[model samples]
Target chain A: MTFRDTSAIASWHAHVYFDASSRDAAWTLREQIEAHWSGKLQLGRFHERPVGPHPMWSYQLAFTQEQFADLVGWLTLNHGALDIFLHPNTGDALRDHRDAAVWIGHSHELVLSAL
Target chain B: GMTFRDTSAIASWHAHVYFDASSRDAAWTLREQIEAHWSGKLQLGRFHERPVGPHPMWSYQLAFTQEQFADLVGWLTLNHGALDIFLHPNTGDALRDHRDAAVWIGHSHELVLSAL
Candidate 1:
């Protein structure tokens, strides 16, 4: 099967990150996303908030097909180190509206294709 | 090809209709529902060219606002007609290949809600 489908020439994307328990965890994820994948992708908005139900920051990315494949490959290569969960979009009205803030340290996670 | 020259917020709102079934009945019902809920708010973005496929698809876009987007999500979640949904903020430039692509509708967002 062709990995690329030109018949349907349109695409959509969404990237969101929630609190991961500690500031170090957040920083690690962010650093991984930026240092390894920043130049390869385009980000829309960097939303941050503190003192919420949980402290978190969300980064939304939109990329081409090639970029998406790279993301998938990256996740596959680094899965064991980052125990992330796959939360596919379930049409949650509320989740899309609010913006959250989060930090990162140590660089061990990325939520691009994993999300 | 659909050309989005108008950058005005209202100008960006494009409307199209899709149904659960590939029949007139389904189309009519879907149209009625959309009309009732998103009539004035809907703007139809023309395709680069009319779609050519086994089942022709239709799409509508509006200024990607939180309120309108939330409303769309509400309908999709309640009705179960959402194949997939992708949220892309206005890039302010219509450069080709800048947006994301999906071989098939396979991703969705579970947006969290909070107000302060």
Candidate 2:
């Protein structure tokens, strides 16, 4: 539940959301990141409507605890105008995306019931 | 009937194929097959031995354009018997989007949406 609980945290997903206007930019960013970390970067799609708890068109990057800081740092410097929804994997999808999420650009509420 | 829309008024649809540590090989086999044969674009996520975010099980995602949504679902119906899947439309409202416009291929999980 808490960040200190190392046992509760298994991995992390950082979802970078974008729209039609910025789709190309988002893909370029994905390619740039994957060029260095190929398998680590997972490209998402442009969401016309909100899906699950996410409220934007986004791509997700999955990383281990070791890669978390590096990813955050890189995004901080290179993410441009993208919005990121970063959450930990604590076995609780709702709680993680709701209570344990860190947003970078714009924050959007997630719908947990659909999970 | 639970038929998928040919295309969304907005963007596209995505299906996340999930598996556990015990089913890693099967999951990978599916991922490889998808990459090799499927024409749609998809991105694979972590196995997540422990619960990640809202997902309690180990899983990965396959993202596709709206045009390919139905066919991908058909492919999954035939090939994804060993895995659980979470399908949802990509609207802009995360909360309402999943709550109202989501589908499941196997077992489903309860998502916490009260706070949102």
Best by TM-score: 2
lDDT of each: 0.33, 0.61
Cα lDDT tens digits, model 1, A1-115, are 1111222322224343444443354355556667766555665454554222222455555544334334432332232222222222324423322211111111113333322
TM per candidate comes to 0.32, 0.46
DockQ scores of the candidates: 0.05, 0.02
Q: List model 1 lDDT by residue over B1-116, tens digit each.
A: 11222112221211233332344354444445655666655543333123322223433333434235334433432332333222232324322111221011223222122210
Query: How many clashes in each candidate?
Result: 28, 18
RMSD per candidate (Å) reads 16.3, 19.1
**For residues A52-77, could you state the per-residue lDDT of candidate 2 as single tens digits?**
67777777778765665456545544
First chain TM-score, candidate 1: 0.43
CAPRI grade of model 1: incorrect
Interface Cα root-mean-square deviation for all models: 18.0, 19.1
- All candidates: TM-score of chain A: 0.43, 0.85
**How is the predicted docking of candidate 2 categorized under the CAPRI scheme?**
incorrect
Position B59, candidate 2: lDDT: 69
Model 2: lDDT to the true structure: 0.61
